[PDB]
Design a protein around this ligand. Structure first.
Ligand code: NAD
Ligand code: NAD
Ligand code: NAD
Ligand code: NAD
Lengths: 332, 332, 333, 332
């Protein structure tokens, strides 16, 4: 399967890293960004969060050269000018953070067969969470979304609670790492005024559609969940704080056992269960979607609980992108 | 009213700052800590969070000199050796963080102080007050009192407004809390709190808090109805309460906003503030309110289930409440 | 004097703040940026570093309204379309960080402005001024001028005191500098500075600076005698100069302290400050001085070779100097 | 060789990590700190800076158990009560940061044969830097020092300059990561007032004896070097900025070639030479003492230069401790 990465940022670079880590048969034909391949190769090899990678990788003849892989570098900001027809592209990984279905469809017009958006999409874009609803993928879905990092953390936990106890209502907060949409010092973010305030000086409230998105991947939870975010001064790793009213009376220990059991069966490689005294840095490089923190959660009574689940919003999400690409390869 | 400050830390120093920032009968006659007065004077005058103060203040001859006002400096770790009888002390502000058991705190009375105000939740049933919530329940016979935690001072006023207007069925609270002096610059041991020893500015750190249960002490109707947890994050000051609450009556988010706005204008004047501004944590550095309701940040799931957001300067808001409680309790 | 602020960023907003703080008779007639006036008003009123300001300021009818000041908001990226003729502009404060070549900056004059003050070092034939060092060399014929960098404003006053008292043979400067808007929250591309894109709050980041060479422009006797470098570190504001200097005459560290203390009381009043306190960077947030000499931090190897330490609020110190230079130009044009 | 680690902090734990990483024949028989082995095991396994280690490690039977290694845990604050005679201790790694030769000699009185202090020492304590003067070690040296992280970075570079060009005079600044002697929020540090100011809110000047200490390992540089430090908000990795007047005329390129040559020959495994666009995070886990940054340095003229060298103050220094222990093992 021939892919290109459009936007070689945190997610674009770490998707390529996770492809190389599993020796994937996925063929990465090109990388597109706003700068030249020499700088993009440097950013791929040296990572402040995830450490150095691909020490033998070089920029040569306008390509990223790594073993038998030679990946063409492009620097074309306009999707209508991208040479996807000439490069016989099966899937565009759309990871610029700029691109509505109508904007993303320009990749198809430029000759790509499919687009995978590394973010929530607006319009008639099927949204998938590996281990929750990815088997709903149909080859007729030419533009798909892998949802947000937050939805990938919440949806597996919500599915376990739905299947074991039922959910009456849930309100979610994510305490989220700073990301590339934020600023080093106070500046303008036109769609999110708070989001422009200095990232490492502030706790910053933010909107998230993650809780509503769980209602699309698990229709039984439509209208039953909403939530919000706080952006805080860490460079990576985020946590979901789910306050949930269950349909059946249970114990905190029974919830722990249900999540532990799911991690060992239906949610293998998606959910992990820990009882260790973890902090955010313990999840840097963690490939799971959702790590249930058994010690951190609290119970008010037999139906009302606050549950805690960690996610590496960079590497966990990047690993899910590669999982979804490999699933689409096998089912298209 | 003659007071002494035992423990000249974040809270001890900012209590003195807030005394000097108002017209007050309070006479600060002595300060006790573990180091000499020259270093304590330096820390009072230069503050990384709250900026410089009292530029004309000097250390001379074992006293803090501010015009003709002279405060004795002591460096005596043992409460049984403190000269409270000789200094005719009306109230000890107990802000070391070491002495919260009645038996430990009573040693101040044995040493000659008439009353002790603990700047923290107490262990045992020490009368606990939140200004604007239950401070009028103070009795002159109460010789050892607590001003609760910063978090309880943020949550309790909001909980009182909800209780009085709508009723509360159940609530689960998270505080996203600034790093404090109990934390470590790099990973080290914290025997009662393993996570709390992990590098403070590298991590989101879960913590246990009794703040939601403590609301049950000031508002008996809410005993058994609230609990919660904390995440410590890399900001040096300002914290936020995220209250997920099931109310006893059907209402709207707008009705909650109106009730809080009304309370801030009347019964909670100078305790609660109501904002619709695009606020972030740094906007509350130096804020003297106990609880600042963030109208834009909150979400409603339905007519009974809400997630409400309230900010607090855990240093200056709390220090201001200590001075308010001193002025309320003491005879003049 | 009618001014406009082109680029309402850290420097643009704090220039307006410092104008209002001294109740300056300077008239700010317009602000240009890339975003709407309601968001720019919000950023002016709420500042993570310097606290809230102008609580009664409002966005109304495409203007910033503050008492009798009514400032037009523009959102025009192209200097050739800016209405400087219609607004009768005396000085453009050029604070976008995009326009530092004389040819780019001259488009402001073509659009009707009488003068441009670039809030950065300039390329080409642009007279560069440091208040208290060479600002009296300003000539009314200078239609495009530079206020140099924050770093040059910190180093040049100290270099002048050393030059005048002892002479300088050679010097090498490091600035340990706060993170700025050119940096990124997480690793990203900076095409002209690869290191400068690496996560700002995860890294000590080496950077190039022309500040030491620029001192040779304001003090020609020091041409070829200074160079230096920077490290960007995870603080949101306040920077420090570390000057390693070989002096022309033998002295003591205490004689250097006395010369700086004397200068701060006389020739460098309101430009240099002298401290012996145990200061740290946060102590200078909101400090309006160009250069604060840290007497306790410095070291002497011998009677000619010294390491001297001087602090600067790279935001507020520099913004205050912009207002001082505007007021000087007003009085001398 | 039977060793114990006294003070299981950043250096103590990472010394054990580096022993295990090279499968050293050094036998670690005991670890002493102020808290129990369950918490010390947790801190060994989970590291905010260097990531997780020894997943199979357990606290079991009062020991740290890792394969065939079983390390006894102690919690004795008083060196005079440590059971070094009973444990047949060949070398104490003294890494508490509390312990003059007379104070350190109490380890010998308690039954240890030798002490290696992980810091500069006062009194008649031979001080060694691997690759500079470690071959001056004599088995008769019962108390030895591995100097500071900063001295281990500067001394190898200074030796290359001395041998190739000669040094007239040098003034050094280290821009240094925050360390455990610092505070999360403003507090008192009696011998270092600035060092008590909030570590992640400030650039903090400090004194360092590192430049003078180079005069101990390279006597020809006595009286020719001094310097200072700035502590900054990073959790690890530091940089030396050496302003040096050389005894002979040269070029920046000739300095680069001399350091490159040394890194390939006499300074193999001690110095590294890079021309990459490096930043501090690129050296997290770097085992070199001194990494010369060719691109960062500047020349004023043919005798006056500013040279830049990086060091992982935790892992580089810890690796040198293990190198010095193995050198002592081979030469005693
Ligand atoms: N970072 C995370 O935690 C995270 C998690 C899940 C999903 N996502 C989503 O993934 C996307 C990328 O996020 P990111 O964090 O990698 O951002 P980023 O800013 O690191 O990466 C975006 C990249 O796209 C490039 N780019 C910008 N405009 C372009 C254009 N016209 N053509 C080509 N390249 C262009 C940028 O130069 C940059 O390298 C966003 O939609 C984001 O919401 C991010
Ligand atoms: N920081 C906040 O946000 C906050 C808010 C509300 C309540 N509190 C409570 O206030 C108390 C103080 O907290 P802080 O943040 O100011 O801590 P801190 O560590 O800044 O201050 C404690 C001070 O007490 C001194 N001290 C220690 N032992 C002493 C002794 N035996 N005798 C005299 N002085 C001694 C220390 O040297 C230090 O200066 C704690 O109980 C804390 O829970 C803190
Ligand atoms: N920040 C400091 O410490 C400091 C100190 C001295 C000098 N400077 C210099 O001042 C200048 C501004 O720096 P800053 O830190 O304020 O940066 P900034 O990024 O905070 O501000 C720049 C502003 O210009 C706006 N802008 C960008 N392109 C524009 C265009 N075409 N038209 C109009 N507005 C546009 C941006 O939206 C932003 O609001 C730079 O030249 C910088 O080197 C900065
Ligand atoms: N961190 C570095 O960058 C670095 C580099 C080189 C050398 N050093 C030196 O190494 C030493 C340790 O530094 P660190 O950074 O590991 O500090 P640290 O605070 O992380 O470690 C010290 C440890 O000693 C323990 N301890 C304290 N008093 C004790 C006692 N009486 N008995 C037993 N254990 C006790 C503490 O609980 C802690 O775990 C210091 O001398 C320091 O100067 C540190």
């Amino acid at each position: 399967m021939r892919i290109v990465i459009n936007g070689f940022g945190r997610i674009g670079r770490l998707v390529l890293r996770q492809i190389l880590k599993r020796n994937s048969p996925i063929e990465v034909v090109a990388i597109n960004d706003l700068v030249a391949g020499d700088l993009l190769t440097y950013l791929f090899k040296y990572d402040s969060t995830h450490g150095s990678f691909a020490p033998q990788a070089t920029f040569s003849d306008g390509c990223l050269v790594m073993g038998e892989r030679k990946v063409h570098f492009l620097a074309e900001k306009d999707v209508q000018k991208l040479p996807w027809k000439d490069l016989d592209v099966d899937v565009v990984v759309e990871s610029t953070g700029l691109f509505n279905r109508d904007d993303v469809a320009k990749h198809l017009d430029s000759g790509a067969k499919r687009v995978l958006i590394t973010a929530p999409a607006k319009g008639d874009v099927p949204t998938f969470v590996m281990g929750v609803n990815h088997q709903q993928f149909d080859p007729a879905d030419v533009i798909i979304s892998n949802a947000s990092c937050t939805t990938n953390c919440l949806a597996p936990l919500a599915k376990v609670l739905l299947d074991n106890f039922g959910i009456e209502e849930g309100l979610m907060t994510t305490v989220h790492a700073a990301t590339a949409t934020q600023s080093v010092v106070d500046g303008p973010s036109r769609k999110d005024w708070r989001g422009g305030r200095g990232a490492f000086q502030n706790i910053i409230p933010a909107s998230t559609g993650a809780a509503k998105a769980v209602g699309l991947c698990l229709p039984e939870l439509k209208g039953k969940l909403t939530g919000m975010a706080f952006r805080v001064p860490v460079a990576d790793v985020s946590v979901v704080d789910l306050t949930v009213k269950l349909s059946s009376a249970t114990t905190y220990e029974a919830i722990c056992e249900a999540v532990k059991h799911a991690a060992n069966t239906s949610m293998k490689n998606i959910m992990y269960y820990t009882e260790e005294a973890v902090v955010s840095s313990d999840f840097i490089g963690c490939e799971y979607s959702s790590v249930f923190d058994a010690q951190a959660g609290v119970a008010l009574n037999d139906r009302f609980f606050k549950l805690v689940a960690w996610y590496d919003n960079e590497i966990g999400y990047a690993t899910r992108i590669v999982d979804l690409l490999e699933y689409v390869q096998e089912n298209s």
